[PDB]
RNA sequence: UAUCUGGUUGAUCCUGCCAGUAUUAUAUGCUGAUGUUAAAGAUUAAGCCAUGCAUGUGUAAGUAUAAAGACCAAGUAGGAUGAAACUGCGGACGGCUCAUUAUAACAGUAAUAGUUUCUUUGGUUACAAGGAUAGCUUUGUGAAUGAUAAAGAUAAUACUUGAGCAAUUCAUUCAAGUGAGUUAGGAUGCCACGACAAUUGUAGAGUAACCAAUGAGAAUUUCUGAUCUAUCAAUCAGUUGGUAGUAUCGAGGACUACCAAGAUUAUAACGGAUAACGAGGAAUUGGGGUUCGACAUCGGAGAGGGAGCUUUACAGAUGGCUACCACUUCUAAGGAAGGCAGCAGGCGCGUAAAUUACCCACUUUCGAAUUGAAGAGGUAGUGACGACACAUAUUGGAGGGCAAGUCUGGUGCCAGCAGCCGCGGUAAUUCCAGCUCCAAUAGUGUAUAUUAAAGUUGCUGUGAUUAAAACGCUCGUAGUUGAAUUAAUUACUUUGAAUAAAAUAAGGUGUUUAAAGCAAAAUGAAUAUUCAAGCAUGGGACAAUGC
């Protein structure tokens, strides 16, 4: 090794480089939410699988084993409050069914588009990138921020930012 | 220098050993010091850690003892007659312990059971 | 030998076996820094001595221009390639020519 | 290594330290003492970490030497003085003493102790051997040598110390029924009732203690640092009270 | 404003400050992103006693 | 994501390889609006080096008339302070590199009842003798090094004398913790060393030995574990064991003297290779695995090459010395010292890698100690090695693999393209070009290499009639495997104990998100380990050891 600092990455290429059928199905994605590459589907691909992975490495176990009942029940209490798992759904097997659809839907510039600001979703990344966009109590820059349960009610313009 | 480790050696299964450091001064070695039969001379050596070993190199008189009669009283070494490991050590009249050397009893066969090069001086006990 | 305790040929035969692999044993045999040229270096330095007309193989029919080249560490003579068409002009004798391998490896 | 060392890296102390990995190149290695390497905590830490009192080692350097800090009866002015188990502290510029303690989340937790209850420290006798001239003594955990004690102390007792006459006052057995504080490994930081002991004349001896819940764990021997006798405790606990919680109200609370 | 805590030994309080558009030593006055609203750490020794020793 | 596709034929089904593909790290072509983070002369030369720095240190308590103290303040033992120099401590820490190294080192583990300091901590044991020495004054030499001699002086917490038991050797004996001791310990008799500075501020302690902690420390040592090779089958003579001594801090063939022939080996001894420092770990994996690890941290070794030593608590020290081998410097030609595998920088080597900057303010170390120093450390500059967020632009290609033109000019098996099949001999979907769009995007191709693909190295998991491949056949040692049956170890199996961190998976926490960090608005994850060994324990079905 050779820095202290830790790194990571976030995407990865598909292992099959050139499908008719994964371009129109990203598009349909990527034209449905305005997004500027192809990375955003990969990054929100790889989160996914990241989670889908604990869940279905705990699945394996049962239902007495200790960890099922701390890491399982910590992995749902995530899912919970980041908005992607309904509160109604408390088990295991519903974190396999989620789709890369739950986690788009959390992005704020799917956020805005539900509250009324931006009549399309290219338009409200100006708004996100120009600090028009308050959550809360601190400016954002940044569209991809997926926020949280209790921060839906919470989004709303900013006070003539500079 | 000399030295005490076991890495100039052969192994078990005669395996010439290799090389892979220098000497270390935490093997040291030093010459003996025959301790023959002459005029009181000893040198004191500084050992490890700073500790003080007396070598002697020429004595005269020990402090023999008697185990019968429990008294402890010095006496002249005569000469170096019988030792247990090399027979050219009684020509050259060498000190060191298990050499059966004999005294005459002035003030009371001897074998030192000191170690000269060591302690820095001679002692013993009656066959 | 299938058994519990024999183990000690499963791991003999392998080792054996290991060798007849045409790709494994060229990476571990003495003689990539002998008889390759390149050896582990990715590149080559060396300078232009001979230029040469290469006729293609039967199947094709032309003349594929290409030069002879000694290198700066091993002196061998080896044979390089015009990557372009018309190349053999720009290129010049005694000067820095790089190479590196083609399409299949090595 | 031609000789001691005399850094101690960042990364290489011990984890109980707090230390952060981006904090700095070296950590304070504590100077020779009382207390063994592991088995301490420099006092640089407890006036910069624990307390919070110093912004950076810059002004640790005009507070220790300033002789402000007494540690156990006397006063120390070393830097890196190694602050081990429970030996009081004292500062009366600021009115506030403490005590390093163990705790069950594997630290160094700094109960308060009152200043009427501070001229005392319990000590665990290491060893008892008869020095020449027939006179025998005693070694305590912080290699503390006293003159005669009691004929009855044994080698793996407890004794209650005082500070400023540095008598010995009661002394509590290894038996039974006594009640231990955790000084090693999975069970350091631990307050229970030994309940059992099996001795394996080999290697090691293997004791059992069962919590005040009804909770039993064992340890080896030399962790066993007697604390009372009887479920009764000489010393003022720590917040938890010394107890352990098998993670079941860990995650579940931090949340709210 | 925010956190105000008075030094019982060296003779000086720890103070946060938030700007919202000589016994005073100011440090770690940055800002947020884009520029605004400005922090910072201000010491305050009160007698120049101790601030003349305990200083660097 | 437990994944394949093009290529042998007129056509089909196969074995089988080549090519395509994705990822990681090395160099390079094109391009490069930013902010965060960040490797960087390791591979070829542990090759050679100009220059500048990297270990120095002072409080009221070691010694100070400096003719220094009108620079704070006067001064009758020297006022506060004080450059120097004597003395004390340190440069055995730290930083760098990976040449040697194949049961060697190293990792876990047990031992030191076979050794042990330094620093630190607890405890114990004459109203004051003496010389000389620097700093101080005076004479010089030579080009000189951190060069140098004589003389006149002058002090000690420098060197000795001197007064009020501890520990060491031998011989004998009495004998209680520990699993384990003629053991701690006591007593008897000589032998040796034999003290608690002939010590210090007017105002803020030190010394000499000894017992014990330090310290799981250092060092020796026990058990297990390492890549290929039989075009390496036999290897060793201080070698294996014993006795006595020697040396060491200490056991010990570590060394010497005498005696015996013993020690290892198909379960691979001995020897050979490395582009071999080992580990925590990294890349990639459905599972199993393959490859890498000079390099953050730990352990080992070295300072151009060996060798021998000084100081001391620790060095066989090299930013110490001495001799030789090979280099290099000034020169007054007589002579002198030097070792950048430390920090910048230079030559050479190469496909291959940055400023001859500033500061001890962050972390920490050393010191006579709050203050001095630190090319450690921090900051600053280059930097498309990489990782994260995010503006409005290039590369490759457009026959199949593989997304993208049944457009137009020439060339005429020529130039050329082409990773594989292939396109080009006059009507080219591939050449050189004009228009258009396909993939990615501040990224994008090539060349080399690890991994997956590869069930083309097989334990999971292959094939052997005809594709490659059952020895001509039988006997046979080592090795592997071995029918049913019973109402002291080992292996297996289950729990624990203890086990460096960092890293992997993560528990929480709006660095605004993210990479990150362990921070903040008291918490440190129980954090899960840890292959292979070692200890304890519940069980005895399947297993091996002879009765």
Same mark, same amino acid.
């Given at each position: 090794?050779?820095?202290?600092?830790?790194?990571?990455?976030?995407?990865?290429?598909?292992?099959?480089?050139?499908?008719?059928?994964?371009?129109?199905?990203?598009? +349909? /994605?990527?034209?449905?939410?305005? $997004? #500027?590459?192809?990375?955003?589907?990969? !990054?929100?691909?790889?989160? &996914?699988?990241?989670?889908?992975?604990?869940?279905?490495?705990?699945?394996?176990?049962?239902?007495?084993?200790?960890?099922?009942?701390?890491?399982?029940?910590?992995?749902?209490?995530?899912?919970?409050?980041?908005?992607?798992?309904?509160?109604?759904?408390? +088990? /295991?097997?519903?974190?396999?069914? $989620? #789709?890369?659809?739950?986690?788009?839907? !959390?992005?704020?510039?799917? &956020?805005?588009?539900?509250?009324?600001?931006?009549?399309?979703?290219?338009?409200?990344?100006?708004?996100?990138?120009?600090?028009?966009?308050?959550?809360?109590?601190?400016?954002?820059?940044?569209?991809?921020?997926?926020?949280?349960?209790?921060?839906?009610?919470?989004?709303?313009?900013?006070?003539?930012?500079? | 220098?000399?030295?005490?480790?076991?890495?100039?050696?052969?192994?078990?299964?005669?395996?010439?050993?290799?090389?892979?450091?220098?000497?270390?001064?935490?093997?040291?070695?030093?010459?003996?010091?025959?301790?023959?039969?002459?005029?009181?001379?000893?040198?004191?050596?500084?050992?490890?850690?700073?500790?003080?070993?007396?070598?002697?190199?020429?004595?005269?008189?020990?402090?023999?003892?008697?185990?019968?009669?429990?008294?402890?009283?010095?006496?002249?070494?005569?000469?170096?007659?019988?030792?247990?490991?090399?027979?050219?050590?009684?020509?050259?009249?060498?000190?060191?312990?298990?050499?059966?050397?004999?005294?005459?009893?002035?003030?009371?066969?001897?074998?030192?059971?000191?170690?000269?090069?060591?302690?820095?001086?001679?002692?013993?006990?009656?066959? | 030998?299938?058994?519990?305790?024999?183990?000690?040929?499963?791991?003999?035969?392998?080792?054996?076996?290991?060798?007849?692999?045409?790709?494994?044993?060229?990476?571990?045999?003495?003689?990539?820094?002998?008889?390759?040229?390149?050896?582990?270096?990715?590149?080559?330095?060396?300078?232009?001595?001979?230029?040469?007309?290469?006729?293609?193989?039967?199947?094709?029919?032309?003349?594929?221009?290409?030069?002879?080249?000694?290198?700066?560490?091993?002196?061998?003579?080896?044979?390089?390639?015009?990557?372009?068409?018309?190349?053999?002009?720009?290129?010049?004798?005694?000067?820095?020519?790089?190479?590196?391998?083609?399409?299949?490896?090595? | 290594?031609?000789?001691?060392?005399?850094?101690?890296?960042?990364?290489?102390?011990?984890?109980?330290?707090?230390?952060?990995?981006?904090?700095?190149?070296?950590?304070?290695?504590?100077?020779?003492?009382?207390?063994?390497?592991?088995?301490?905590?420099?006092?640089?830490?407890?006036?910069?970490?624990?307390?919070?009192?110093?912004?950076?080692?810059?002004?640790?350097?005009?507070?220790?030497?300033?002789?402000?800090?007494?540690?156990?009866?006397?006063?120390?002015?070393?830097?890196?003085?190694?602050?081990?188990?429970?030996?009081?502290?004292?500062?009366?510029?600021?009115?506030?003493?403490?005590?390093?303690?163990?705790?069950?989340?594997?630290?160094?937790?700094?109960?308060?102790?009152?200043?009427?209850?501070?001229?005392?420290?319990?000590?665990?006798?290491?060893?008892?051997?008869?020095?020449?001239?027939?006179?025998?003594?005693?070694?305590?955990?912080?290699?503390?040598?006293?003159?005669?004690?009691?004929?009855?102390?044994?080698?793996?007792?407890?004794?209650?110390?005082?500070?400023?006459?540095?008598?010995?006052?009661?002394?509590?057995?290894?038996?039974?029924?006594?009640?231990?504080?955790?000084?090693?490994?999975?069970?350091?930081?631990?307050?229970?009732?030994?309940?059992?002991?099996?001795?394996?004349?080999?290697?090691?001896?293997?004791?059992?203690?069962?919590?005040?819940?009804?909770?039993?764990?064992?340890?080896?021997?030399?962790?066993?640092?007697?604390?009372?006798?009887?479920?009764?405790?000489?010393?003022?606990?720590?917040?938890?009270?010394?107890?352990?919680?098998?993670?079941?109200?860990?995650?579940?609370?931090?949340?709210? | 404003?925010?956190?105000?805590?008075?030094?019982?030994?060296?003779?000086?309080?720890?103070?946060?400050?938030?700007?919202?558009?000589?016994?005073?030593?100011?440090?770690?006055?940055?800002?947020?992103?884009?520029?605004?609203?400005?922090?910072?750490?201000?010491?305050?020794?009160?007698?120049?006693?101790?601030?003349?020793?305990?200083?660097?």
């Amino acid at each position: 090794g050779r820095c202290l600092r830790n790194h990571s990455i976030t995407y990865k290429t598909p292992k099959v480089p050139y499908e008719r059928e994964r371009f129109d199905a990203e598009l +349909k /994605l990527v034209g449905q939410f305005g $997004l #500027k590459n192809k990375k955003e589907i990969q !990054r929100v691909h790889y989160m &996914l699988g990241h989670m889908r992975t604990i869940a279905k490495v705990m699945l394996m176990k049962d239902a007495k084993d200790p960890k099922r009942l701390l890491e399982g029940a910590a992995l749902l209490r995530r899912l919970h409050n980041l908005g992607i798992l309904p509160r109604d759904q408390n +088990k /295991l097997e519903f974190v396999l069914a $989620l #789709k890369e659809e739950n986690l788009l839907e !959390r992005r704020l510039q799917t &956020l805005v588009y539900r509250k009324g600001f931006a009549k399309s979703i290219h338009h409200a990344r100006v708004l996100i990138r120009g600090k028009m966009i308050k959550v809360g109590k601190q400016v954002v820059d940044v569209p991809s921020f997926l926020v949280r349960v209790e921060s839906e009610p919470l989004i709303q313009l900013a006070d003539n930012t500079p | 220098g000399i030295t005490r480790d076991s890495r100039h050696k052969r192994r078990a299964t005669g395996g010439k050993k290799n090389s892979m450091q220098k000497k270390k001064k935490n093997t040291m070695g030093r010459q003996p010091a025959n301790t023959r039969l002459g005029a009181i001379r000893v040198h004191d050596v500084r050992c490890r850690y700073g500790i003080i070993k007396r070598r002697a190199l020429r004595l005269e008189n020990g402090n023999f003892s008697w185990a019968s009669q429990s008294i402890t009283k010095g006496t002249k070494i005569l000469n170096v007659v019988y030792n247990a490991s090399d027979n050219d050590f009684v020509r050259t009249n060498t000190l060191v312990k298990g050499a059966i050397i004999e005294i005459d009893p002035a003030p009371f066969l001897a074998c030192i059971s000191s170690r000269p090069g060591q302690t820095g001086s001679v002692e013993g006990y009656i066959l | 030998a299938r058994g519990l305790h024999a183990a000690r040929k499963m791991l003999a035969q392998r080792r054996a076996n290991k060798w007849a692999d045409k790709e494994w044993k060229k990476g571990k045999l003495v003689t990539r820094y002998k008889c390759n040229p390149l050896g582990t270096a990715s590149h080559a330095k060396g300078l232009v001595q001979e230029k040469l007309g290469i006729e293609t193989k039967q199947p094709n029919s032309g003349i594929r221009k290409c030069v002879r080249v000694r290198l700066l560490k091993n002196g061998k003579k080896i044979t390089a390639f015009v990557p372009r068409d018309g190349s053999l002009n720009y290129v010049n004798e005694n000067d820095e020519v790089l190479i590196s391998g083609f399409g299949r490896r090595g | 290594a031609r000789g001691p060392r005399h850094h101690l890296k960042r990364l290489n102390a011990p984890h109980h330290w707090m230390l952060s990995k981006l904090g700095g190149t070296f950590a304070p290695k504590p100077s020779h003492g009382p207390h063994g390497m592991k088995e301490c905590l420099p006092l640089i830490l407890i006036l910069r970490n624990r307390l919070n009192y110093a912004l950076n080692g810059r002004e640790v350097t005009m507070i220790v030497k300033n002789r402000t800090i007494k540690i156990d009866g006397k006063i120390r002015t070393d830097t890196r003085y190694p602050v081990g188990f429970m030996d009081v502290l004292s500062i009366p510029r600021t009115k506030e003493n403490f005590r390093l303690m163990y705790n069950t989340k594997r630290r160094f937790c700094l109960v308060p102790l009152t200043a009427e209850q501070a001229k005392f420290k319990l000590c665990k006798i290491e060893k008892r051997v008869l020095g020449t001239g027939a006179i025998p003594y005693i070694v305590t955990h912080d290699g503390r040598t006293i003159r005669y004690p009691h004929p009855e102390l044994q080698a793996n007792d407890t004794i209650k110390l005082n500070l400023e006459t540095g008598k010995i006052v009661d002394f509590v057995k290894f038996d039974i029924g006594n009640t231990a504080m955790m000084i090693g490994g999975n069970g350091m930081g631990r307050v229970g009732v030994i309940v059992k002991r099996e001795v394996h004349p080999g290697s090691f001896e293997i004791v059992h203690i069962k919590d005040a819940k009804g909770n039993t764990f064992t340890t080896r021997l030399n962790n066993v640092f007697v604390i009372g006798k009887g479920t009764e405790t000489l010393v003022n606990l720590p917040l938890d009270k010394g107890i352990k919680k098998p993670l079941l109200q860990q995650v579940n609370e931090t949340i709210k | 404003t925010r956190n105000l805590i008075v030094n019982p030994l060296l003779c000086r309080k720890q103070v946060v400050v938030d700007i919202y558009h000589q016994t005073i030593v100011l440090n770690g006055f940055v800002t947020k992103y884009g520029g605004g609203k400005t922090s910072g750490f201000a010491l305050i020794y009160d007698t120049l006693s101790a601030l003349k020793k305990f200083v660097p």
